[PDB]
Design a binder for this molecule. Structure first.
Ligand SMILES: CN1CCN(CCOc2cc(OC3CCOCC3)c3c(Nc4c(Cl)ccc5c4OCO5)ncnc3c2)CC1
Ligand SMILES: [K+]
Length: 292
């Protein structure tokens, strides 16, 4: 709205940049989109202002603005601020106990389940697949819960219509096997929900590594840290996941802990090569609730 005062830059990449801003006394996060990502800015804006997307575990919308002149375009998305930053940065220095670990993973599954499920009525919403789920697109709150942030690559589906993208978009390190070997049924909306579930299982692994049991804990590592380089190519990922049939390694110490044991069983059922065999977000949520 440019009544915002852009204080400090808290993120910078291909997507654009994210600024901590001040708007009427309160802190806000301002994502400044490139002109090359105009379609992503509008899709994310339209979910927020037309679908009325809102949930305790989804990044809170505040405002969206576009100003465009002949030879100038500025694309702003304004949301609630979260001073703890991404789950990725949060896991770097923090360790977790059983309670705070389950609060992180259950809140993520709660937000993902809310995205996936279609709601009917005048105040309803379509089914939504995220398609770029990863630890850098998840923010941590002060209460220890998380929200899902980046909705630019989302796809929607309403049973009341025949409405239905991008071929190979998303972080390659988090791509599902059916995306890498190109067998994904791009015309079934359920394929994108299952691609989100594969990514969710990778994040489960990232978080559980940082949970202490028996005085032990693992350093933060990204998924497949030990078998691919940084910025891995599409081919590197296809060799590791599709050909070598490799999955993130479960430390043996997890099995001495019954909580890390259940999360381990949850990860495996998100990593099936057969996408139809993978759990749904709703089933993951119910399972995580029983653990408490
Ligand atoms: C240097 N540190 C000092 C303090 N602390 C600040 C908290 O950092 C953020 C960063 C955000 O975005 C980054 C998240 C990781 O990937 C790069 C950007 C925040 C954020 N981002 C955001 C996303 Cl991911 C998606 C849509 C958005 C957004 O803001 C406007 O609309 N939103 C809220 N708070 C953030 C705090 C750590 C850094
Ligand atoms: K809040």
């Amino acid at each position: 709205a440019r009544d915002i005062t852009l204080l400090e830059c808290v993120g910078k990449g291909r997507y654009g940049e994210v600024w901590r801003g001040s708007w009427q006394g309160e802190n806000v996060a301002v994502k400044i989109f490139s002109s090359r990502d105009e379609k992503s800015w509008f899709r994310e804006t339209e979910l927020y202002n037309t679908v009325m997307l809102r949930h305790e575990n989804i990044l809170g919308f505040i405002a969206s603005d576009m100003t465009s002149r002949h030879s100038s375009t500025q694309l702003w998305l304004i949301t609630h601020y979260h001073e703890m930053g991404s789950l990725y940065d949060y896991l770097q220095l923090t360790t977790l106990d059983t309670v705070s670990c389950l609060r992180i993973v259950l809140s993520i599954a709660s937000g993902l389940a809310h995205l996936h499920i279609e709601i009917f009525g005048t105040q309803g919403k379509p089914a939504i697949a995220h398609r770029d789920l990863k630890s850098k697109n998840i923010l941590v709150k002060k209460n220890g819960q998380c929200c899902i942030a980046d909705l630019g690559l989302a796809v929607m589906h309403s049973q009341s219509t025949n409405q239905l993208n991008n071929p190979r978009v998303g972080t390659k390190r988090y791509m599902a096997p059916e995306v890498l070997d190109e067998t994904i049924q791009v015309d079934c909306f359920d394929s994108y929900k299952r691609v989100d579930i594969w990514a969710f299982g990778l994040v489960l692994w990232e978080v559980a590594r940082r949970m202490v049991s028996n005085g032990i804990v693992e350093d933060y590592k990204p998924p497949f840290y030990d078998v691919v380089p940084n910025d891995p190519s599409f081919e590197d990922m296809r060799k590791v996941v599709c050909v070598d049939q490799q999955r993130p390694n479960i430390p043996n110490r997890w099995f001495s802990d019954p909580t890390l044991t259940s999360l381990a069983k949850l990860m495996k059922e998100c990593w099936y090569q057969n996408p139809s065999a993978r759990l749904t977000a709703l089933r993951i949520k119910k399972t995580l609730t029983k653990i408490d």
